[PDB]
Design a protein around this nucleic acid. Structure first.
Lengths: 146, 54, 124, 100
RNA sequence: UUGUGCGCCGAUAAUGUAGCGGGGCUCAAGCACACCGCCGAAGCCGCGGCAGCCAACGUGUUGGCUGGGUAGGGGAGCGUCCUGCAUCCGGUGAAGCCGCCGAGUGAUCGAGUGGUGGAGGGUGUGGGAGUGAGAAUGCAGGCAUGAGUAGCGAUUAGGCAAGU
RNA sequence: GGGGAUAAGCUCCGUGCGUCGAGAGGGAAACAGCCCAGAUCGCCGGCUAAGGCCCCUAAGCGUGUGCUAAGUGGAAAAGGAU
RNA sequence: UCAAACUCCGUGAUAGCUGGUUCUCCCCGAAAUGCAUUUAGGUGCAGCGUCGCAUGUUUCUUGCCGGAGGUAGAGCUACUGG
RNA sequence: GGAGGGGAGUGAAAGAGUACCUGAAACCGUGCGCUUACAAUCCGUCAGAGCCCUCGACGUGUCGUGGGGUGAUGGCGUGCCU
């Protein structure tokens, strides 16, 4: 029959993506693909055999058009008139990592397995991270030519 | 108001498990020599021979 | 002759109730609810036997795409090249090769790249 | 070494001594049959050309004729009164691969 | 200026973004025109089983077409009980009931088995039906849910000591 | 085509027109009546239809030549507009 | 219990109305139209299903040929009306 | 205190004790195995990790033409009748 991963089959690696001057959607899609494990031939939608992804320089990320001051991030508290909106500009200047986190999280499945996969994403607004002990592998967003 | 639906067994049992009794705590005492258990609230009364021990 | 209904009814009731072991709540205890759930279960099984072939083909295609992009080639170009080269391995065994024998998958990728045209966008 | 043999409209990855369930073949148990091959993987080199695959065949011995799992079908459409019960057990043969 | 391809205001309601399905996209993941692939259904093909109609040759095989379906029409069957006849089983344990292991295209089956039980059953071939329920705000009996919940029936009131 | 204010998810007729009714499967987010296609059963085989191929989500952040700045794409008129 | 009490009987009153009608599989497979109707949510006959018998392609599709129209279009000192 | 029960006896049987043949279902417990307290579930179905039990083969655990129980997790999925 088709191969199925067992208890100790999944092996995880660490990647770091430098978000400097990278389109938000492009980086978010690449990071979602890495987190889901779609790049591994042993992929199984049942299992979270993905990899740990580190994103540094989250505040340097590139947003095209006028989406910096015309795209809103919304949230409702649950109380009447509890709708709050911030543009990408102030959201970046206050919580730089939140833009990248929101974008990536919106691109992976909304099941419980997606909640588990979220745990393997670390984003940092600075150029450095505290995960040097894991020796992350630098990652470049390339496109396979056809 | 009346119940619109019949309870499932899980909900009925989960609510019903909260109707229970707690075990009173017991301490030892010496009345007429023999040791026996008594609630601490009645220790003084037992020592004064005011509580019937069967 | 007056006929009592017990034996004839108990037969099918036992069959349905035995088939419904493991269900939750009324669906495993009462014959009527178990019978409704059995109707739904057999409809579901019939639909899912048909859908299972497509589900497994989708999983195989996902694995083949991953292993092909690991060899710097896309799934669609790889399938076109394999068809051009005349090799007749289906997606099930292609995914099996991708997981179990990566060297064989790389060799097949090489032959598929060889069989491809020189300009894939040419009006050929 | 192993090969991918075709039988009954399907392909199976088999090695020597493998036991594989397969669609019904008109052969008695204890007999031997030869099957075409879609790919041969011996060690490192991979045989994929049509002519080389035609020059090779996989020989297997019929172990027994068995039956598949029982399948219960009960077609149903609500608010119609339509039901249709049906059963099915597929016929199969068990082949043990002798060599490639 | 003339026609044109895309664009701009016009544009504008009351739970919450809310007139891309979401993330997001102009570094197009937008549009137009050409080109090349692939995905994609119970469609078609491959391999195996079954059935209806017809054909050929035969004394049942092969082949060709066909096999969604309500109202409804036609055909063939499963299970229940009582019985004529004929056979077989049974206190060395029938029926009924509860399991295990299997079986048939279906209703279903198990002269396969284990436990319980204590007196009648099976099979073949005919005869006859009070012959099959899931629902009629159906009927009788038993039992759930609400739930250890409401209430424990006035407008006077009980207490202590001793006894049993 | 008639009635109604050629307004209605209004009503009444014609149509070897379709589908649903009595039709599952795929697509249109969901979606009796729209598009593809008519389910005898099994398969962990292949090719396609409509519709698609950045991630959710299977398959192209496909190739070549141009356009758009409006997030137009991803709702609307008379009319207005270096 | 009262715009004609209650009980039993006629009696299993009668309802073009409402509800219900119990095992399986195989083959085929509709209609929601016309006419009449104290008629319009009913029914009769016809239309459409199925089964049997009889008859054979008479059915259907495409090409060609022979026919009659007064629609679309157009036209009007060719008529009648505005 | 009784009711009731435990030994002991009767009985072929007390899984025949005057609540008594057989003793089904709903309903109510007790014990063991698996699972379950970040999760939006017509409660199933298709894949399926892990754990437990069982049948075979070879060693000491490790596969198999295996079988059962439970199922984290993913896909699909709008109760029956009228």
């Amino acid at each position: 029959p088709t191969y199925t991963p067992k208890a100790g089959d999944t092996t995880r690696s660490w990647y770091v993506i430098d978000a400097s001057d990278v389109v938000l959607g492009r980086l978010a899609s690449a990071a979602a693909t890495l987190l889901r494990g779609k790049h591994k031939p042993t992929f199984t939608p049942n299992v979270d055999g993905g990899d740990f992804v580190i994103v540094i320089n989250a505040d340097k990320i590139a947003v095209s058009g006028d989406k910096l001051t015309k795209k809103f991030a919304y949230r409702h508290s649950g109380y009447p008139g509890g709708l709050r909106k911030r543009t990408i500009g102030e959201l970046l200047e206050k919580h730089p990592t939140r833009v990248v986190e929101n974008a990536i999280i919106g691109m992976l499945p909304h099941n419980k397995l997606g909640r588990q996969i979220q745990k393997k994403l670390k984003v940092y607004a600075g150029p450095d991270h505290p995960h040097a002990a894991q020796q992350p592998i630098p990652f470049e967003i390339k496109q396979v030519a056809q | 108001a009346v119940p619109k639906r019949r309870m499932s067994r899980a909900n009925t049992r989960s609510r019903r498990a909260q109707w229970k009794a707690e075990a009173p705590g017991l301490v030892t005492v010496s009345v007429a020599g023999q040791q026996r258990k008594v609630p601490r609230r009645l220790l003084k009364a037992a020592r004064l021979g005011l509580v019937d021990l069967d | 002759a007056r006929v009592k209904r017990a034996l004839n009814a108990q037969k099918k009731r036992r069959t349905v109730l035995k088939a419904s072991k493991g269900y939750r709540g009324q669906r495993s205890r009462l014959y009527r609810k178990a019978k409704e759930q059995q109707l739904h279960s057999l409809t579901y099984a019939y639909r899912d036997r048909r859908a299972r072939k497509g589900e497994f083909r989708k999983l195989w295609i996902s694995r083949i795409n991953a292993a092909a992009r690991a060899n710097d080639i896309t799934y669609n170009r790889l399938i076109q090249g394999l068809k051009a080269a005349g090799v007749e391995v289906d997606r099930k065994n292609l995914a099996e090769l991708a997981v179990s024998d990566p060297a064989a998958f790389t060799a097949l990728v090489d032959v598929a790249r060889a069989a491809l045209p020189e300009d894939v966008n040419a009006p050929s | 070494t192993y090969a991918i043999v075709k039988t009954g409209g399907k392909q199976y990855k088999v090695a020597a001594g493998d036991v594989v369930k397969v669609e019904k073949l008109d052969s008695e148990p204890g007999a031997s049959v030869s099957l075409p091959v879609a790919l041969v993987v011996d060690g490192a080199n991979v045989t994929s050309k049509a002519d080389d695959l035609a020059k090779v065949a996989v020989t297997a011995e019929v172990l027994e004729h068995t039956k598949g799992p029982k399948i219960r079908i009960h077609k149903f459409k609500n608010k119609t009164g339509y039901h249709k019960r049906q059963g099915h057990r597929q016929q199969l043969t068990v082949l043990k691969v002798t060599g490639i």
